[PDB]
Design a protein around this ligand. Structure first.
Ligand SMILES: [Cu+2]
Ligand SMILES: [Cu+2]
Length: 502
């Protein structure tokens, strides 16, 4: 149905501070119901948005800028998407919110803990709530971060509703690299959605072929949207100048993984991963992008003046990709006149490369089944509410060995830290399931170049052990690690992570 490439790509405006001095920058962001048209041929869609915008405003900060954001809830008391009351037990408000700055090196009470939620005007607050005004010291590498809702049992719904936005940390020490900047540095927040004829968002209230005993609504274990949006617009086009652009590619989708290419066979240059600039730039013809991953890339349109180039997708969601729909992301049109000379660069040398092993943690990804027969996905056999087990000591380095005996990939995220990827190694799934015994079926494989820098969300593929290494700090406190497939996260593939200080 919806005609591709008829609406221009929105570029969210950069948020202006309410107050700013040399010592402190203070922002206010209020979650509001709002209405926006997502495609030329759709009626406007009721959404929830940060400052009533979808996506939310892009926040731009400097490394070490002392930033505060008062994230406020001015949402209705009843949700518009289907709440499953059976997935969590503790009366509480139906609509609960909390903002997680994904990738932030953030004090624990500003990290957006799932039980630090709040209702409208903070009238009711969860048992881990401490503060209204979140503090982001930004003492971390320049990078693409993003912010999104993280409320207990509601994350998949609140994010789907529209509560996502970009947050960019600029390190002045990188300015000398002359990477494309300003108008030539564009975030691309990719979100798949299913939209009804009347313009309303569709989110399933049950899996296919439910029983009458099955809760209604019921959580589903995965969501694949019919349409692809970039920056809140269905299959948009972007007019570009014939020169180099930097794009901050963010997968803000609930479940869907992308595998991106350019339909002319042209290359990307990757310059950065979740945790900042790679040590060296990486020429790529394609890349996978699972939920919450970011690729910081340069696309050089210099030789392509007048051309239309599709950012294409080869990964299916619930089936093979459809050439007419989800195989398309957006269309670049190289038809904008040059505003000035391209004085940007695509340097090879970007940053220095990524220490004692304190602990090695072996962690399994697996599910159980509930009383209604639905899968409940768990991190190392535990529910969210079980006593904490992942308890690294502050200032120490650990290796985490993530065993995935399930049928699909899980994008695992650690809060607070970024980590290095050591290797992946295939193992005998049936043996592991039958006995707990890990028997490798092949040699360990080091990460691709794209994963030789710093990561915070990482694909743990089926039938493999993935090893990562992280140094836990600089802060101690109560954080989280989770699978970022939101349908998994909410039931119940998330755990507390305590970074302890003796
Ligand atoms: Cu996240
Ligand atoms: Cu998962």
């Amino acid at each position: 149905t919806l005609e591709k490439f008829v609406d221009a790509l929105p570029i969210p405006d950069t948020l202006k501070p309410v107050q700013q001095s040399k010592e402190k920058t203070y922002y206010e962001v209020t979650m509001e119901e709002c209405t926006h048209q997502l495609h030329r041929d759709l009626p406007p869609t009721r959404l929830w948005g940060y400052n009533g915008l979808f996506p939310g405003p892009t926040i731009e900060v400097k490394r070490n800028e002392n930033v505060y954001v008062k994230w406020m809830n001015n949402l209705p008391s009843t949700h518009f998407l289907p709440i499953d009351h059976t997935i969590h037990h503790s009366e509480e408000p139906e609509v609960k919110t909390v903002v997680h700055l994904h990738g932030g090196v953030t004090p624990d009470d500003s990290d957006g803990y799932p039980e630090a939620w709040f209702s409208k005007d903070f009238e009711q607050t969860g048992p881990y709530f401490k503060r209204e005004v979140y503090h982001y010291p930004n003492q971390q590498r320049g990078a693409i971060l993003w912010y999104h809702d993280h409320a207990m049992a509601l994350t998949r719904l609140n994010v789907y509703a529209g509560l996502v936005g970009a947050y960019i940390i600029h390190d002045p020490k990188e300015k000398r690299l002359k990477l494309p900047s300003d108008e030539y540095d564009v975030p691309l927040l990719i979100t798949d959605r299913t939209i009804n004829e009347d313009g309303s968002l569709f989110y399933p209230s049950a899996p296919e072929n439910p029983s009458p005993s099955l809760p209604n609504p019921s959580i589903v274990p995965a969501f694949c949207g019919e349409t692809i949006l970039v920056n809140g617009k269905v299959w948009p086009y972007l007019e570009v100048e014939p020169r180099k652009y930097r794009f901050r590619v963010i997968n803000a989708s609930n479940t869907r993984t992308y595998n991106l290419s350019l339909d002319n066979g042209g290359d990307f240059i990757q310059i950065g991963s979740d945790g900042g600039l790679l040590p060296r730039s990486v020429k790529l013809n394609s890349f996978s992008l699972a939920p919450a991953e970011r690729y910081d890339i340069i696309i050089d349109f210099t030789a392509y003046e007048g051309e239309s180039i599709i950012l294409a997708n080869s990964a299916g969601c619930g089936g093979d990709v459809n050439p007419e729909t989800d195989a398309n992301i957006m269309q670049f049109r190289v038809t904008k006149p040059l505003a000035q000379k391209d004085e940007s660069r695509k340097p090879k040398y970007l940053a220095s490369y990524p220490e004692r092993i304190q602990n090695i943690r072996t962690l399994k990804l697996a599910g159980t089944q509930d009383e209604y027969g639905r899968p409940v996905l768990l991190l190392n056999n535990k529910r969210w509410h079980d006593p904490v087990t992942e308890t690294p000591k502050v200032g120490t380095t650990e290796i985490w060995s993530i065993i995935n005996p399930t049928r699909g990939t899980h994008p695992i995220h650690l809060h607070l830290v970024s980590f290095r990827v050591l290797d992946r190694r295939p193992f005998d799934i049936a043996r592991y399931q039958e006995s707990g015994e890990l028997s490798y079926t092949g040699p360990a494989v080091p990460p691709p170049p794209s994963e030789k820098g710093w990561k915070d969300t990482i694909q743990a593929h089926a039938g493999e052990v993935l090893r990562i290494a992280a140094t836990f700090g600089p802060y101690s406190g109560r954080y989280v690690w989770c699978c970022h497939i939101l349908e998994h996260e909410d039931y119940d593939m998330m755990r507390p992570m305590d970074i302890t200080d003796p």
